Design a binder for this molecule. Structure first.
Ligand SMILES: O=P(O)(O)OC[C@H]1O[C@](O)(CO)[C@@H](O)[C@@H]1O
Ligand SMILES: O=P(O)(O)OC[C@H]1O[C@](O)(CO)[C@@H](O)[C@@H]1O
Ligand SMILES: O=P(O)(O)OC[C@H]1O[C@](O)(CO)[C@@H](O)[C@@H]1O
Ligand SMILES: O=P(O)(O)OC[C@H]1O[C@](O)(CO)[C@@H](O)[C@@H]1O
Lengths: 290, 290, 290, 290
């Protein structure tokens, strides 16, 4: 029942990640105590902790129309795109972020392929963080007594093929043909296998995290209502795509890898299909055939 | 930023509820720190806290094959049927319980209509308890610093009609005709209205709680795989049926109210459809017509 | 085991007290996790939370040589003198503050008699706050789960006469004659009564708080080493003098009430003798006779 | 801001220490929430956690007149003497314990020299445990979020000579000549050095812990009122004597080392003088000369 603690590592980058985690700790504490007000607070904590890291030059927030430029005093090398509070019914909500090195708004419009670090936090019974700096995915638990994030699994790997599919089937009347076919195959396998189970929390970080630890596939594809999908490329899709690919998974828009999409605006939406590679590949077969 | 605290109330009954809440506080703390081991612990905490309340005579636990009879020393008037830990991916899991007055195992086999109190706890970012002693539903938050449950809403009422439907559609190939028709109507409304949204966490307490605070309908109906449904009558369906009806909702097996089912065994399963009354009533129309 | 919470009250004044409590909550959390660094942090939290209350115009901090003037944007009516962190061996350390209405540094140099509110926090096993706005002393416990201060006793009253005396007797060779005589009487009562017990934590807030709840007397009188005493008039002696007098006690320098001392500098020291009135009065008799 | 955790170690002995720590965690939580009732609870937690370790055969508690014999079912090799709750004014109170290997009550009446492990917990702003299994003293912090004790210093060593003396000088009129002389020398050094500072919290664990981390001397010697001292040999003096000696200090009754006293009853009191060795040695010189 006794432990020793040791500091864990994965320059300006380290200070920036510490400050993003420090904001996550504060948001966790606010969420536990608890809408519009939480969104504002969360945004303030992220922006201000990130700015006073002295590591940032440009931020993009889900909450702010335009990119935020760091005061010249505090400027550093990195660009951060984040969703401070993504997602009341205690459904686990989250924080999502991706970090780039600078190249103006320009700097925030890079291919996901250029990511240097990314992560998400999920505010559940425990506050969990998944993080990658390009050498796999590590999972951490917030210890709010220490004020520190504890490593709980190294180099998380997603299953090659899962048995869960996850999307809002309430949009069935708007689905494109490939989504309709794929869903039909999950429920009516044509190969003598059992149907997949269905899960959809309706909070992206919750659904993506389940997909990472249990395997399967998560989808918010384009539909007649949302022709470009709903989820946001810079600070939702790209970060989770990076995490999922670093765990051995795939993430696609249907027509290309999410991380290869060249962004055309900071609040651009894209379709998102991700998870176990054999599952995503099966979805991709339905696309190409339609 | 300053508060005063006041004790809240809804004899042996009060001691019993205090001890069930005390077990819930301990389980919350165990869950936050975290499978089979948790199930065992949770069960131990409930049984032992309940037994030393000196208010119980018979317990039924999801975890135990036979009913547990309280030592004659500690015996009181009440019977408690509970699921100590219902539901790893931080999906909110829960504890469910219903309390009866005695009439042997016999005493645990009463109609839901005979319930004196019931509740559930959901272990999310916060640990929430819904409770009723027959005069409506009250919602409480665990304050683990005080070690006490704080009232956060009195007399919770569910919406007459919602816009969410919640079931595992991965069982579509096993659905009975009425379930197939109902799902089809939610996705393809024949009245010019928008489709319902779909949500399914796959943890009953999470799905039921969302249904109470946002409205809509939750279903685990009979299907070819599970001809009697999956969820357990004594300590899952009856307790949540009691809560939901006390909030102005309905809960049915498809052929009768859950609380009117006369149990034939302690671990008996029944189909469960519950939520907003107009939604459940619509489901019932699909049944009667098939 | 169930509670209801109700907001408690004692305009700009209320916003200011909320922000001082909010800083106390943050300091509590920092202390629990834990020298020079804590002093700096504590100071930052107080100054910044107080400034963005929009209720302050001038601050005096134990940590800062000169008075801090609030930016004209954020200016309000009140003046706050505080010791952000007063007192490693887990000895309970504290935060002390007094609030005045403005009249420049001038505004911080008022008689204690002019205080509008004052308090201290003690960071023990629990974080406790004593507070007065002039209508007695109220005691609060920090509930760090709610993020709120809970009332635990109204209108705290100190005993007329106690049985504890509290001072650093290691300074005996420097004591003035009246202190020597008084100490001698506590140990060698000339009236057939039992000796007083001795207690000295060596952290002022700990010693003062014990004196309030158990009764007796606390002293840091002048001595040959410290001819004006050690403790600071504006943000140690005056605040605790105000609290102690509001609980029915007395606080003196030996020659006059602490709250009547007209300050001659912001970091001025004064002797401090406080506690149960009959005890302080006995000390005062030793003074007048010498 | 990221950490890794590693299990720390110092057979039945390990299970016993885990269960004593588990009781300490529960007591910490009770203290934080808070007299006679706490004493009872604390005692229950220790006894029951210790008994179900399956490592004990005989317990002695400050709270119980006679030794407690473990049910033959649960019996193991070890004997535990403990003070479950030693020491309301937030003064840090504590838990003290010493562990022996068996030789009946007989087994609890061994010389301190026979101790296999001992420790104390102090319930402050943080809950700290000092522990030794005979290879020095290790200091741990309770992390109540993890439910685990974190190592914060290895092999703690007390200063050879300190500058604090700690005793209740309110007993001056009852002191024996050697105590009077020693106190006089601390206040009136005859060697041109400065007087010692005085500290006395009046809670033994608080005073002993300060003495370990800051150095100096702590005394509760015999006096006319308490001719055998006040503190209890088996579960106060012996445990802290063992800790203090393992940190390079000394602990004496005035006439012999505490750990060499052969106990004559389980609730026997002895005088206690402990701390920095040069300080204790100086006290011993005053004894021998009187
Ligand atoms: O209700 P819908 O259309 O299924 O939207 C769900 C999505 O909306 C969001 O809340 C918006 O980012 C995501 O968390 C989630 O994945
Ligand atoms: O995976 P399925 O068949 O949808 O089962 C989900 C149900 O199983 C349970 O875990 C068992 O009680 C419920 O919490 C939940 O509602
Ligand atoms: O060591 P000394 O001289 O007794 O000083 C103790 C005093 O010093 C302080 O730490 C300084 O404010 C007070 O908390 C305390 O009352
Ligand atoms: O009030 P006194 O005689 O100084 O007693 C203090 C002692 O009493 C105890 O509370 C009893 O164990 C100890 O914690 C402490 O050292």
């Amino acid at each position: 029942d006794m432990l020793t603690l040791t500091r864990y590592v994965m320059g300006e980058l380290t200070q920036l990640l510490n400050s993003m985690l420090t904001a996550i700790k504060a948001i966790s504490s606010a969420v536990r105590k608890a809408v519009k007000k939480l969104d504002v607070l969360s945004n303030s904590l992220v922006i201000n902790m990130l700015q006073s890291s002295y590591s940032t030059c440009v931020l993009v927030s889900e909450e702010n129309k335009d990119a935020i430029i760091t005061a010249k005093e505090k400027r550093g090398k990195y660009v951060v795109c984040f969703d401070p509070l993504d997602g009341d019914c205690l459904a686990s909500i989250g924080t999502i972020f991706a970090i780039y090195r600078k190249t103006s708004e320009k700097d925030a419009l890079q291919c996901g392929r250029n990511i240097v670090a990314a992560g998400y936090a999920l505010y559940g019974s425990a506050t969990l963080v998944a993080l990658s700096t390009g050498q796999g995915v590590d999972l951490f638990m917030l210890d709010p007594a220490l004020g520190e994030f504890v490593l709980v699994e190294k180099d998380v790997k997603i299953k090659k093929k899962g048995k869960i599919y996850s999307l809002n089937e309430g949009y069935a009347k708007y689905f494109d043909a490939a989504t309709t076919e794929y869903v039909q195959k999950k429920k009516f396998p044509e190969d003598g296998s059992a149907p997949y189970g269905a899960r959809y929390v309706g909070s992206m970080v919750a659904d993506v995290h389940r997909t990472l630890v249990y395997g399967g596939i998560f989808l918010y594809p384009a539909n007649q209502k949302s022709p470009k999908g709903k989820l946001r490329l810079l600070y939702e899709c790209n970060p989770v795509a990076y995490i999922i690919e670093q765990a051995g998974g795939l993430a696609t828009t249907g027509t290309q890898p999410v991380l290869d999409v060249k962004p055309e605006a900071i609040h651009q939406r894209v379709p998102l299909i991700l998870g176990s590679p054999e599952d995503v590949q099966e979805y991709l077969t339905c696309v190409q055939k339609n």
